[PDB]
Design a protein around this ligand. Structure first.
Ligand code: HEM
Ligand code: HEM
Ligand SMILES: O=C(CNC(=O)C(F)(F)F)N[C@H](CS[C@H](Cc1ccccc1)C(=O)NCCCc1cccnc1)Cc1ccccc1
Ligand SMILES: O=C(CNC(=O)C(F)(F)F)N[C@H](CS[C@H](Cc1ccccc1)C(=O)NCCCc1cccnc1)Cc1ccccc1
Lengths: 424, 424
């Protein structure tokens, strides 16, 4: 099974026995993709243990995999286990079981359902502000992920259920080389999610929203599973990106102020953000997108090719994991001038047309893109408005400059993001 | 996972933890099915370890599973491992990979391709006769499987390749309870087929037939895999059924003689069997079918239901193994008068119409029935003609009467079949 890419004439790094190419991960998912893009070009292949993975960087082939051929060939991602009852989580569910969940959960983020949330989100921003107001009157450097995550959790627990609260590579490696082991642990009730975190949220907080539109077909224990996915995403993604944004706004203060100028213009007299005002602030949208260009928290996009196929002149055999190196594509000089620099004018209406939506995919594409994309943009933006309407952000003595990325996991920073905060 | 049949309102024996219902196998595949048919009726469910199995006995639902819904829902059988390169064997291959093999191997048993084999098979029958002539002049009781299997091998090695030669529940159990283990051994090169039997037939006997119609798309190592399936089937099935037949002909001598009468009538002056003469001997066909009613060597038919479905008023969930208890159906008094008795007049043109081809399925049905059905009938019949044209068969002092069936495995006898042979 280690000669497939040799047989198909697809270039790639030479795999070692059993391990595959996993030892190359010693600089992260990303430095590996950025490297292989340079060594081999538009298409290359490698192995996660015994699992062949084909990496593609061709926009047409990309568009083919995620959109044109999704329902037929590329419906599902790489199997993830041990999972337990989380196999039915929408992000993990396969084929027809996924099609049913995606439909039942689609109407949660309609432009009207989000618009219903602008009044309820509007509370914890003031909880957010007042919490940042206490650690700013004091010149104590702030850990931004913690105050954002406290906010992010406050939104996800209420935006979906309605509980108000003031929020104040160990073994997975083995899996890659031992995917044959996954059904082993599937019969041991072993979960990658420690069975004490799930027994907890197995609080069936349902009473006599996201919670609403479910019981309004669907089961109950699988309702738990979906809730975990949303609580996690709505928490960690928002917090993480909010931290990436504040770091970039401080090291680039001209961007931070020019943003502040737009916010106080659209919202005069520190006005309260509403749905329609947020969709008018362009420079805000540009800053968010440019951060997501530099820091796509998903790093990769994956689909299991579920039958033999010839797309865009390349044959692809059943079972191969097709992969899209999002991080590498967002940083490719063959599409971006000086790609390491935080330049939000890449996303201005003058220049926003010179960008392929299959090179820039921070939320995926096709029927299995990020179901929570529009929410995340809205939730984050409301945070950025309220936070920046009051405070500026300077680097501090401990602030990591330049910021190193962590290794594997998600796109997360090595040392936490800590910045000075000043009150306007 | 042990409450599915409880949830679906499907009756069945109460499963034990981990083991499922496998401890009930202590009287064989068959006494278990015959029992559960009586306890529960048209439909029941059980577990092979963690694997739910739904057993159906409704002719319409049967016809639906094997024919109407084969290509959509019930394309594949229960996964079998560890297999190695034998995953590509046609009997084992799944979905689209199977559709391609079945087409490429279909034209091997056209009525003309078989007709081409009547002259070549006609040799080893005389090799067969002369070998039985030596152990009959001596009143030494004969082991029939051995002289048949020697014949059966002589046909399969030449009918498919062309080499002429005078042919003179241990761990599988664990699998049922440890199906999660199968990919474990799949990475160890562990095969249920001892790697020394395969390294052998990996004799690539191909030179500068079944062998022919292959190289005339198809690979090479998978060509080996197909050859093993045919060599085995063409050997053991023929030998086994030939033995079941001779046992029944001896204990029922009126049938043995009335057969002998038909053979010497259609083939006067001990004439040589040809293609068209064999398809005129009806009473021969009746004897073969009635033996295959009592002794269906496959015992069961299985399909993995690959998506949610409602057939004939019963919902069936994805992943369940649907099963057809062939042995139990061939022995059901609700379709056969006095079903334990060897009565070949069940298959006479007067009475052959009162038989459902979805209760009587010795070769399966639908697109995945026995691809070698017509060959086996022909090969066996030529054996029966030549053998019975010369010798009678009496029970002997050691002959097992009544014959006990073995446990599990295939439909094979406990003590071997040994009978007296007399020369006419
Ligand atoms: C900055 C915030 C976020 C980013 C950058 C992001 C990005 C992504 C990406 C790249 C994917 C995979 C797309 C693909 O495979 O083609 C994805 C999937 C998904 N996201 Fe997000 N996401 C974010 C926030 C959220 C939030 C707040 C939710 C709330 C529920 C969410 C729910 C999901 C789900 C359920 C999936 C799986 C969808 C499916 O497989 O059908 N995400 N996201
Ligand atoms: C008395 C002789 C035989 C009997 C009773 C018999 C019976 C069966 C049965 C019941 C099946 C399963 C059908 C189903 O799942 O619906 C089967 C499949 C099969 N048989 Fe036979 N068989 C015999 C001889 C042979 C011979 C001589 C060959 C020679 C190649 C052969 C090749 C196969 C193959 C390849 C399959 C799998 C077909 C597929 O899955 O597409 N069999 N047989
Ligand atoms: O994590 C991989 C990487 N594969 C691997 O082999 C590896 F060993 F490294 F782990 N794959 C995702 C499928 S499992 C994951 C399990 C989980 C984690 C935390 C909490 C609950 C469940 C999962 O549900 N995540 C998406 C849920 C939230 C989210 C995050 C980010 C953006 N939107 C939504 C598929 C996936 C990847 C990136 C983005 C979305 C979805
Ligand atoms: O053996 C089961 C039972 N399942 C189980 O879980 C169990 F643990 F018990 F083993 N299933 C068959 C799929 S594997 C088998 C592997 C093999 C065996 C010997 C030589 C080569 C390969 C296989 O290729 N056999 C069919 C090949 C020859 C044949 C025999 C009889 C009739 N025609 C052809 C599927 C199957 C069953 C019955 C009849 C045909 C096909």
């Amino acid at each position: 099974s280690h000669g497939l890419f040799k047989k198909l004439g697809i270039p790639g790094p030479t795999p070692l026995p059993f391990l595959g190419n996993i030892l190359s991960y010693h600089k992260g998912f990303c430095m590996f993709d950025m490297e292989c893009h340079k060594k081999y070009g538009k298409v290359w292949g490698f192995y996660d243990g015994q699992q062949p993975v084909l990496a593609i960087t061709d926009p047409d082939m990309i568009k083919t995999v995620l959109v044109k051929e999704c329902y037929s060939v590329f419906t599902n991602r790489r199997p993830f286990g041990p999972v337990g009852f989380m196999k039915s989580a929408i992000s993990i569910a396969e084929d027809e079981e996924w099609k049913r969940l995606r439909s039942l959960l689609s109407p949660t983020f309609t432009s009207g359902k989000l618009k219903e949330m602008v009044p309820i989100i509007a509370q914890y921003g003031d909880v957010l502000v007042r919490n940042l107001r206490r650690e700013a009157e004091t010149g104590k450097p702030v850990t931004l992920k913690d105050v954002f995550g406290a906010y992010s959790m406050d939104v996800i627990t209420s935006t979906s259920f309605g509980v108000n609260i003031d929020s104040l590579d160990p073994f997975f490696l083995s899996i890659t080389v031992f995917p044959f082991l996954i059904p082993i642990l599937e019969v041991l009730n072993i979960c990658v999610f420690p069975r004490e975190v799930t027994n907890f949220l197995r609080k069936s907080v349902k009473r006599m929203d996201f919670l609403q539109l479910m019981i309004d077909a669907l089961s109950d224990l699988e309702l738990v599973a979906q809730s975990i996915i949303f609580i996690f995403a709505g928490y960690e993604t928002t917090s993480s990106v909010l931290s990436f944004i504040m770091y970039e706004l401080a090291t680039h203060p001209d961007v931070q102020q020019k943003l502040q100028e737009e916010i106080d213009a659209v919202l005069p007299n520190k006005a309260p953000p509403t749905y329609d005002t947020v969709l008018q602030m362009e420079y805000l949208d540009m800053v968010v997108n440019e951060t997501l260009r530099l820091f796509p928290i998903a790093m990769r996009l994956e689909r299991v090719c579920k039958k033999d196929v010839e797309i865009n002149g390349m044959f692809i055999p059943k079972g191969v994991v097709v992969m899209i190196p999002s991080y590498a594509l967002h940083r490719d000089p063959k599409y971006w001038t000086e790609p390491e620099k935080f330049l939000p004018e890449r996303f201005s209406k003058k220049n926003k047309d010179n960008i392929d939506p299959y090179i820039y995919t921070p939320f995926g594409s096709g029927p299995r893109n990020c179901i929570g994309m529009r929410f995340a943009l809205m939730n984050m933006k409301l945070a950025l408005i309220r936070v920046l309407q009051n405070f500026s952000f300077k680097p501090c003595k401990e602030t990591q400059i330049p910021l190193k990325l962590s290794l594997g996991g998600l796109l997360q920073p090595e040392k936490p993001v800590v910045l000075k905060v000043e009150s306007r």
